[PDB]
């Protein structure tokens, strides 16, 4: 019950509210003045219970009607203020809003923080309740926001300000209202909220954050959000606005990492240095330094990688003297991938022709591509060795050499463009293998280029009726992955015409799946323009109509997180009815690629995939491991590996094959000794089937990629920056792997080399302002945010001290433990430039 | 099972009662001491006394003789007994031989007296460790409840021993003891590294060459603390 | 093989602030859960073979199925099986049974009427052991532990790093530590660290009290310990947490005490499981005890327990970290200076800091305040901290 | 002081409303329905079908299983206690049905009277209890699982510093077996039992593992948890059947690991004590030595607390030789360091004599822990070679960090 | 079993009167120690605060 002070205050409140019965002149001003005074005193204090509000439980009906009849001036406004404060505690949402709306304006700050928050919530509720039928109510709510937002800004309440500004769908005022000490908080809030908000508000929020960062001149972050938006005009605007040459070099490094090559005018000083950095010619050299820091110059051999000295030699000296072709292809992939990018191998460099001569047709192409893939990012160094094998006796393997070129020029660009020159006279080659090699090399060398000359040169291949189905598919995929995430009308129209003119009998083959691929590869991350795409694709008949629609639906929403598209895809998967299950497989890959945008969505996609596996039909069971591989590329999560190990022994050969490839992709480059042991056990168990052995050895090569210093992650910048080229590469490999026997185990091993398009390295090489390497002590650990929305860089814990260059595993980041240097980019990934601290004093 | 007598060796040759005697020192307030070219300084963590308690009787810096003083850490009564015995022995040495007692000799006597209480059963070892500073040449020695003495350029015993010594080794430089004020400031900083009250719980005694003791009043110590704070204010 | 049964956990939703970002992440979780529900509801709804297989096998075996113990395998289809009543029967082994699974002492499903071997029971796990397995991972994570960097690093190198990165251990040649005892004063973070590692680990986790592994009947104690460790072996990557090992880890000594000798037999079986004849495999053991000096040396010796992680009373930096973590969900005022609580020598542990925060919240609620102040924390310090009586000697030492 | 006022319902409503409620209600409801949804999924799947012995369809494919079920009949196992032999024409047979009862039955016409000898176990029909089939003699399952049948990979070169212990062990468990002629010529009966005792981790179980590794005879690793049975006298019967199985094998080896479990001291002042465990220990005592000579059964026993053993068991007629494992000397500790650092990726300049001298009173297990900790230190800072400083830090972390409280100021007492 | 019943009937309040009997200061080994009472002590201590967090139990 009450107290003496409480009872006296209750009596005073009751007297003040009861005096309003009649219309005496000295009632409305005195009583409302007293109520205003008490309410303001209680509300403008600590969060203590508002004692006047607790005591006040009257009815305002008489108060509302008298409001209607008495004092059209300020007294009704005082009454409105009082009833608004009273109804903030009660449930009078619309009335409580309109009391502040039409009553005494004064200011929302004069009431209290809680009153401001409640008014903000009610304003958001009304705005969501108000449609475009009338804009009369919108303007006063906007005026309320005009004062609500600065209140939150000045009282560290940026949460409510940002939320309200997202409800009203208007975010322009953040440009003119954000302070120096609060830009990071709101910017991080937006860059985290963009992933979960659906279309089209995510793009508006992204451009709002872009404008904020431009206003505060945080140019690297502006570049990050510009690549998030995937629009070149604002990237060019940021490039022009960058007046600091060190920031220019940093943004060139990040552009090269993302693979975005924008033409630079000669008006910008130091054009040559920026161009050569963006071409990423230096990377290999740094990689070499990397390797000579870890004493891993010496390349490995497949015999030691398989560890034959440990396998139980049940048949000794009688069952291993025969060298089958398929195991030779697997050993080529191993003695490639494992030793790749180190500039040397002990079996393909000194005994090349002898090795290649024990391969047949497809083995020739695979080994020729692996010869270039054993030396990465050295265009001249790679081609100096590739030319002789291009001059080979078996001119059919010439195409393979082109792959080598295309696999050597990957991740780099030259002014003279050796790849374009070398393949310009070979693209029009009538031989199917020659044209295939030419187009594949051109695509791999020019991933993400979007250069009009190469696209125009690739156009006539689609209209060539002579060109075979697999030539058409490889051409379509190369065109798509040269024009990743651009919605190029030229390529879209060309592929649409090619598929429209294609016959059903010729469409029934597996390679026709690669026709939507490039089309889909033209529309990565842009789901707005795909209504016309689906309308155009609706002309073709089912089932391939549904197949193409599903594939373009995946490609449109790559990482979008649109749960409605995932619901449609899950409905497709759950429909229990050969080619009919292709739709379900593509939809499963769609759930994977949409959910990999967000960590939460991905981890729930894990549970959905488990449910699909334990309760799905054979086609879904085959499809899921590819999805699991897509979800966690180069992220050896133990639960995923355990599920894949459980299903590697399944009685369905396709399911086991897909599970093995999922081991290879998920644990790629992590050098996981547990994964290596499990793969050795799988090789021992599957020692009889050539296909299982081939794919398990491929998985071992993938997991020993670069001796553990290479990753296939399509994500960068704390996994927030997507990579269109890498996403394209994994998409091609996975959709080809939807049919392992006909494509992977058939005539199309070269498709595996598309993963090298996604081949991106991990280091911590630190450069000075002049780009010389600089050893800096670095604190490396997990980025587990021990705070909420404090704006912290996840507050790296699990500390370990390192000297650069350093190797960072997936999910573990780094920070500068020394204040002597300041990084231009606060995200310590890849090559960075540290400016000497001017604030530090000796 | 081998720690209930002073004359029993442990199976690994440990005199456990002697080792236990050092915990009494470990329970005492920190006493720091350094030697300079012309001065020997020694500060003491002077823990706050009760409101009604007279602090005159609570003395940790005691002068064994006009040329040598001593600050203990450990049991107070054992410290009183040891200090009285040291004074008597120094006077007796001055009586037998004309020249005054050297700080090394008085430290040797104190160490031998402490040892002779650890050799016999039915005689509790002294639970104090002492810092003895004097001129003969400025010399600083430290005793031990075990009965071992050592010569130091700088110690600190008592509650803060590892921390204050850790501060001391990378602070005792040639220029640090170049000036008498510099040496006293070094002692003040070393004591402030442990005594986290400032001024009110710091008592420093300085003995200059061929001079007498001078307990620093809580205004000169306040001035030195202010100077140290001003010097450390260069961080900003 | 029977790979690990890792506990399931929902993704962490951060920030923990009551903002729209938390709403969006939680609604994404709800979306995906509803997707799973829709799929799992329409799966069996659209299900239109093996039914003949079931109608034959189940009819042949019939219900109920008795559970007996295999004793002898006489022929390829005849076995001497002992029923639970201890009566042996020479019964037949039906065709639909894997002859390689039958081993002496195995649990075998028999027909109710003719007791013929109709199948083999695989698990036959003691209910007191299957309850030790953790199904719901605890919510406490490594981000909820203030300070304790050395202890967390040691425990990660022991039980976490070998699972994720065995490459280092295999390359250098070390066998990773397979036993850790978390010892220290109570309320320092031992059980909290066990909760955190259980949350983080991808391996199966078994939680034991060090006293539920003790049974009434004479031989069921060591048998239960053996069953628990065998279950840990089954799910190969395993972590066996035995809180309060003091209950059984006490030092061996000679007395009549007919129950104490069984106590010592149980602890002897435990140490045999830890390191005795035959290898232990890839199962780690985490042990916690307030008093370690009272433990038997043969239990905490290296090889059985490789690491002894000390949990001291938190220092100033650690205490400040605890206060920052445990008031993160609070709404602190501007007049609050947590430092005064962190300083002084109250010898307050992490649990003490948690209680201080809770009591400060209660003090604020007493004044009808949802935001705490410095005065509330000061009152809570004296209100809660009154734990020890004297713990100190008199003014002997100067 | 001012008493705390109660919290009225209006106050509760205000505190739970006058604050964050824009998203608090929605967040809480979403969390609650998330928990309910998780419960729904778990319930709706909720099977995890238990594995049962269902063979592959091609394995059985037998419609005659029902014919076997109905035609063949179950038989209860019972040992023929006695042959009555009334007139050698209606002989009668007294059988004992385990615990059910005892009966006087006759054989079925299928079997011959000469094929059913006294004392063997036979199958009887459940209705007329008539003998139907002779059975092989009972072999306890757990007793046959007590055998090792899988030699561990611990050789004798992995036990350093115990040369005398190894030689005395091989003198009792290996030499009298491989070359018995070296003893009968001198008329010496070699000891038939060895008690391995010493500090924990000194290498008793390691030496037992080596013995089992190169035994070449029947090795039985007795489990101390199985001699301890729920029912009265079952542990004694366990010992009897174990010794009988050992006697069936030619010159078997038995290793009672951790003998303190069932080798306590007999007593009666405790008003009952164990009794059953004491009875099992007494039967083991009887089997070891006494009437009914044990035979060629050399017995291995290990315990790192031997003072609690029964003096009857400790008597040198059951455990004749008492091999003691002591803390290794400097040379032995160097040997252990070299053994345990053999496979490590360490430097070639490591002075292992220094490390051995730095661990005065340390068992071999502590040396192994020191090596592992040196590797861990070399891993923490990611060096691929473990240097001498890493080993010194490991020695400090393992030995000195937990040895005693003799701090450096207290360690200044020695020079 | 007491704590499992309290959880199954949650919310619940457990009143443990005269906790000196089981609850007193823990002893070392040796024949003097009660041991089993300390075992019940440790089980109760973990039950009310251990690896598994009690909900709505006071
Ligand atoms: N370092 C710490 N960081 C954060 N919270 C801590 C820390 N130490 C203790 N706590 C808090 O104290 C609570 C109780 O501590 P905990 O359960 O870890 O006890 P303990 O150390 O295992 O003690 P006992 O000897 O009783 O088993 C934890 O739930 C946690 O919230
Ligand atoms: N001489 C040695 N050489 C090498 N390793 C040794 C040696 N002595 C002991 N060890 C190591 O000690 C480890 C554990 O010792 P062990 O299992 O023999 O203990 P125990 O003394 O029998 O103890 P318990 O009292 O538990 O029976 C072994 O794994 C082994 O690596
Ligand atoms: Mg605990
Ligand atoms: Mg042992």
mmCIF file of N, CA, C and O and ligand atoms in Angstrom, chain C residues 271 275 298 301 304, chain D residues 158-162 199-206 209 258 304 336 339-340 364-365 368, ligand 2:
data_model
loop_
_atom_site.group_PDB
_atom_site.id
_atom_site.type_symbol
_atom_site.label_atom_id
_atom_site.label_comp_id
_atom_site.label_asym_id
_atom_site.label_seq_id
_atom_site.Cartn_x
_atom_site.Cartn_y
_atom_site.Cartn_z
ATOM 1 N N UNK C 271 40.707 -44.437 -12.512
ATOM 2 C CA UNK C 271 42.083 -44.177 -12.934
ATOM 3 C C UNK C 271 42.587 -45.247 -13.892
ATOM 4 O O UNK C 271 43.470 -44.974 -14.713
ATOM 5 N N UNK C 275 44.247 -44.081 -17.442
ATOM 6 C CA UNK C 275 45.537 -44.552 -17.946
ATOM 7 C C UNK C 275 45.853 -45.871 -17.243
ATOM 8 O O UNK C 275 46.268 -45.871 -16.082
ATOM 9 N N UNK C 298 47.912 -40.713 -7.430
ATOM 10 C CA UNK C 298 47.833 -41.553 -8.620
ATOM 11 C C UNK C 298 46.730 -41.112 -9.570
ATOM 12 O O UNK C 298 46.727 -41.535 -10.729
ATOM 13 N N UNK C 301 48.213 -37.510 -11.303
ATOM 14 C CA UNK C 301 49.552 -37.604 -11.854
ATOM 15 C C UNK C 301 49.526 -37.394 -13.366
ATOM 16 O O UNK C 301 48.497 -37.599 -14.015
ATOM 17 N N UNK C 304 47.682 -39.535 -16.554
ATOM 18 C CA UNK C 304 46.264 -39.629 -16.252
ATOM 19 C C UNK C 304 45.589 -38.268 -16.377
ATOM 20 O O UNK C 304 44.599 -38.119 -17.092
ATOM 21 N N UNK D 158 60.892 -48.855 -24.835
ATOM 22 C CA UNK D 158 60.155 -47.661 -24.448
ATOM 23 C C UNK D 158 60.039 -47.512 -22.936
ATOM 24 O O UNK D 158 59.280 -46.661 -22.466
ATOM 25 N N UNK D 159 60.766 -48.321 -22.171
ATOM 26 C CA UNK D 159 60.770 -48.250 -20.713
ATOM 27 C C UNK D 159 62.203 -47.955 -20.296
ATOM 28 O O UNK D 159 63.024 -48.872 -20.166
ATOM 29 N N UNK D 160 62.513 -46.682 -20.082
ATOM 30 C CA UNK D 160 63.860 -46.280 -19.740
ATOM 31 C C UNK D 160 64.072 -46.138 -18.244
ATOM 32 O O UNK D 160 63.161 -45.802 -17.495
ATOM 33 N N UNK D 161 65.305 -46.405 -17.818
ATOM 34 C CA UNK D 161 65.692 -46.243 -16.434
ATOM 35 C C UNK D 161 65.313 -47.378 -15.513
ATOM 36 O O UNK D 161 65.587 -47.291 -14.309
ATOM 37 N N UNK D 162 64.699 -48.438 -16.026
ATOM 38 C CA UNK D 162 64.253 -49.564 -15.217
ATOM 39 C C UNK D 162 64.929 -50.856 -15.656
ATOM 40 O O UNK D 162 64.301 -51.913 -15.717
ATOM 41 N N UNK D 199 56.111 -45.679 -6.898
ATOM 42 C CA UNK D 199 55.305 -44.469 -7.034
ATOM 43 C C UNK D 199 54.465 -44.519 -8.294
ATOM 44 O O UNK D 199 54.820 -45.207 -9.268
ATOM 45 N N UNK D 200 53.327 -43.824 -8.321
ATOM 46 C CA UNK D 200 52.498 -43.811 -9.532
ATOM 47 C C UNK D 200 53.243 -43.215 -10.715
ATOM 48 O O UNK D 200 54.021 -42.271 -10.574
ATOM 49 N N UNK D 201 52.993 -43.779 -11.894
ATOM 50 C CA UNK D 201 53.611 -43.288 -13.106
ATOM 51 C C UNK D 201 55.052 -43.689 -13.299
ATOM 52 O O UNK D 201 55.713 -43.145 -14.190
ATOM 53 N N UNK D 202 55.568 -44.610 -12.488
ATOM 54 C CA UNK D 202 56.963 -45.013 -12.607
ATOM 55 C C UNK D 202 57.173 -46.031 -13.723
ATOM 56 O O UNK D 202 58.307 -46.203 -14.185
ATOM 57 N N UNK D 203 56.110 -46.685 -14.188
ATOM 58 C CA UNK D 203 56.215 -47.552 -15.344
ATOM 59 C C UNK D 203 55.810 -48.994 -15.120
ATOM 60 O O UNK D 203 56.217 -49.877 -15.879
ATOM 61 N N UNK D 204 55.013 -49.251 -14.082
ATOM 62 C CA UNK D 204 54.554 -50.613 -13.823
ATOM 63 C C UNK D 204 53.616 -51.097 -14.922
ATOM 64 O O UNK D 204 53.807 -52.180 -15.489
ATOM 65 N N UNK D 205 52.597 -50.296 -15.242
ATOM 66 C CA UNK D 205 51.672 -50.673 -16.302
ATOM 67 C C UNK D 205 52.360 -50.691 -17.658
ATOM 68 O O UNK D 205 52.004 -51.501 -18.518
ATOM 69 N N UNK D 206 53.351 -49.822 -17.865
ATOM 70 C CA UNK D 206 54.109 -49.850 -19.112
ATOM 71 C C UNK D 206 54.890 -51.152 -19.252
ATOM 72 O O UNK D 206 54.930 -51.751 -20.335
ATOM 73 N N UNK D 209 52.488 -53.839 -20.106
ATOM 74 C CA UNK D 209 52.147 -53.752 -21.521
ATOM 75 C C UNK D 209 53.247 -54.347 -22.387
ATOM 76 O O UNK D 209 52.964 -55.034 -23.370
ATOM 77 N N UNK D 258 46.327 -53.320 -10.873
ATOM 78 C CA UNK D 258 45.780 -52.535 -9.769
ATOM 79 C C UNK D 258 45.153 -53.457 -8.717
ATOM 80 O O UNK D 258 43.945 -53.454 -8.467
ATOM 81 N N UNK D 304 50.518 -49.287 -7.194
ATOM 82 C CA UNK D 304 51.258 -48.177 -6.609
ATOM 83 C C UNK D 304 50.736 -47.764 -5.230
ATOM 84 O O UNK D 304 50.839 -46.593 -4.849
ATOM 85 N N UNK D 336 64.884 -41.741 -20.428
ATOM 86 C CA UNK D 336 63.452 -41.501 -20.601
ATOM 87 C C UNK D 336 63.217 -40.271 -21.470
ATOM 88 O O UNK D 336 62.322 -40.259 -22.325
ATOM 89 N N UNK D 339 63.854 -41.222 -24.988
ATOM 90 C CA UNK D 339 62.783 -42.082 -25.485
ATOM 91 C C UNK D 339 61.567 -41.248 -25.872
ATOM 92 O O UNK D 339 60.988 -41.422 -26.950
ATOM 93 N N UNK D 340 61.169 -40.319 -25.001
ATOM 94 C CA UNK D 340 59.933 -39.576 -25.218
ATOM 95 C C UNK D 340 60.096 -38.403 -26.174
ATOM 96 O O UNK D 340 59.092 -37.897 -26.684
ATOM 97 N N UNK D 364 58.611 -41.221 -14.849
ATOM 98 C CA UNK D 364 58.644 -41.197 -16.301
ATOM 99 C C UNK D 364 57.451 -40.487 -16.908
ATOM 100 O O UNK D 364 57.573 -39.836 -17.951
ATOM 101 N N UNK D 365 56.285 -40.605 -16.272
ATOM 102 C CA UNK D 365 55.108 -39.888 -16.747
ATOM 103 C C UNK D 365 55.328 -38.382 -16.699
ATOM 104 O O UNK D 365 54.897 -37.655 -17.600
ATOM 105 N N UNK D 368 57.420 -37.482 -19.681
ATOM 106 C CA UNK D 368 56.597 -37.421 -20.883
ATOM 107 C C UNK D 368 55.768 -36.144 -20.912
ATOM 108 O O UNK D 368 55.630 -35.505 -21.962
HETATM 109 N N1 LIG F 2 60.724 -45.615 -17.505
HETATM 110 C C1 LIG F 2 59.783 -45.053 -18.271
HETATM 111 N N2 LIG F 2 60.069 -44.805 -19.568
HETATM 112 C C2 LIG F 2 59.134 -44.244 -20.337
HETATM 113 N N3 LIG F 2 57.896 -43.870 -20.009
HETATM 114 C C3 LIG F 2 57.639 -44.123 -18.722
HETATM 115 C C4 LIG F 2 58.503 -44.700 -17.805
HETATM 116 N N4 LIG F 2 57.897 -44.810 -16.564
HETATM 117 C C5 LIG F 2 56.701 -44.312 -16.757
HETATM 118 N N5 LIG F 2 56.476 -43.875 -18.036
HETATM 119 C C6 LIG F 2 55.249 -43.276 -18.551
HETATM 120 O O1 LIG F 2 54.299 -43.248 -17.505
HETATM 121 C C7 LIG F 2 52.991 -43.382 -18.086
HETATM 122 C C8 LIG F 2 52.009 -43.839 -17.032
HETATM 123 O O2 LIG F 2 52.636 -44.754 -16.107
HETATM 124 P P1 LIG F 2 51.905 -46.073 -15.632
HETATM 125 O O3 LIG F 2 50.706 -46.336 -16.453
HETATM 126 O O4 LIG F 2 52.930 -47.206 -15.671
HETATM 127 O O5 LIG F 2 51.521 -45.841 -14.080
HETATM 128 P P2 LIG F 2 51.591 -46.690 -12.734
HETATM 129 O O6 LIG F 2 52.894 -46.316 -12.022
HETATM 130 O O7 LIG F 2 51.402 -48.130 -13.016
HETATM 131 O O8 LIG F 2 50.391 -46.078 -11.855
HETATM 132 P P3 LIG F 2 49.018 -46.546 -11.159
HETATM 133 O O9 LIG F 2 49.254 -46.365 -9.617
HETATM 134 O O10 LIG F 2 47.872 -45.764 -11.711
HETATM 135 O O11 LIG F 2 48.935 -48.045 -11.461
HETATM 136 C C9 LIG F 2 53.191 -44.346 -19.250
HETATM 137 O O12 LIG F 2 52.247 -44.088 -20.281
HETATM 138 C C10 LIG F 2 54.622 -44.044 -19.723
HETATM 139 O O13 LIG F 2 54.636 -43.252 -20.905
#
